[PDB]
């Protein structure tokens, strides 16, 4: 359960490696339901965020609050993510997590598109923990690719994360974990939520106002 999973794995694993994976997070029924909602978003051309603003990502994204009609199971996923982070309260490094972003739903077309190497939060914008959920049924990375490769600072080796179905991924959002998405040869879906550190976000606000 959430508390046991948080205190006995996520907290120790995050403090040791900064990268954490939870498999079969929600179960098959809920996983396929989340997939159905995401596919509905894709089929009705909802991945149009940024499409009206001038400058280059190759994927398509949309932001989900979780309470929109047809997005309820995504909201349920977001609730479960929150339960875990809440049960970690105060024990995740030195962070005091007080908020989060909406869910970013990302679609990778499958024509070799991936995501260039980057750092999620390199300039202290307040994001401390990156949470990704994968909903790709029967993903065989040997053929379909789409592996997320993370290069943790203070490790010799890199960490390869297959976007397997019903998999949850946690990692520090700062310079410790640069990462890239390898080319995708099948439609690849991911849902990402970012949690905020209170004081770092306050410092960021002060910088914006100063
Ligand atoms: O950083 C990102 N996008 C910009 C962003 C994200 C969240 C934000 O929320 C807030 C809101 C308010 C204050 C601070 C942050 C803001 C900007 C971002 C990071 N990785 C990826 N990957 C794609 C594949 C693997 N990784 N794609 C991304 O688009
Ligand atoms: Mn990223």
**Domain with 188 in it: what CATH number?**
2.60.120.620
Distance CA 17, CA 207 (A): 30
Residue 197 Cβ contacting ligand 1 at under 6 Å: no
Which ligand is located closest to the Cα atom of residue 149? 1
- Comparing CA positions, the residue from 187, 111, 181, 186 lying closest to residue 147 is 181
Number of domains in the chain: 1
The method of structure determination was: X-ray
**Resolution in A, one decimal?**
2.4
Distance CA 111, CA 123 (A): 32
Output the residue whose Cα is nearest ligand 1's atom 1: 120
- State how far the alpha carbon of 125 is from the alpha carbons of 35, 195, 204, in Å: 31, 11, 6
DSSP 78: H
Joined tokens for residue 132: 């990704």
**Residues contacting 156, CB < 8 A, separation 6+:** none
Domain range for 132: 1-210
DSSP 6: I
Greatest CA separation found in the chain? 50
Buried/exposed 7-26: b ≥16 CB within 10 Å, e otherwise:
eeebbeebeebbbbbbeebb
Give the containing element (helix H, strand E) for 85: helix 72-87
**Ligand 2 centroid vs 118 CA: distance in angstroms?**
6
């Amino acid at each position: 359960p959430a508390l046991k999973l948080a205190l006995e794995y996520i907290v120790p694993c995050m403090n040791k490696h900064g990268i954490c994976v939870v498999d079969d997070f929600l179960g098959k029924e809920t996983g396929q339901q989340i997939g159905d909602e995401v596919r509905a978003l894709h089929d009705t051309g909802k991945f149009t965020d940024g499409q009206l603003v001038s400058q280059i990502r190759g994927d398509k994204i949309t932001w989900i609050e979780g309470k929109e009609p047809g997005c309820e199971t995504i909201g349920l996923l977001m609730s479960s993510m929150d339960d875990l982070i809440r049960h970690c309260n105060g024990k995740l490094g030195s962070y005091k997590i007080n908020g989060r972003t909406k869910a970013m739903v990302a679609c990778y077309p499958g024509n070799g598109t991936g995501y260039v190497r980057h750092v999620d939060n390199p300039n202290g914008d307040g994001r401390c923990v990156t949470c990704i959920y994968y909903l790709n049924k029967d993903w065989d990375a040997k053929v379909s690719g789409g592996i997320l490769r993370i290069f943790p600072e203070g490790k010799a080796q890199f960490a390869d994360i297959e976007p397997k179905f019903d998999r949850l991924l946690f990692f520090w959002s700062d310079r410790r974990n640069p990462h890239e998405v390898q080319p995708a040869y099948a439609t690849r879906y991911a849902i990402t939520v970012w949690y905020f550190d209170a004081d770092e976000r306050a410092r960021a606000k002060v910088k914006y106002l100063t």
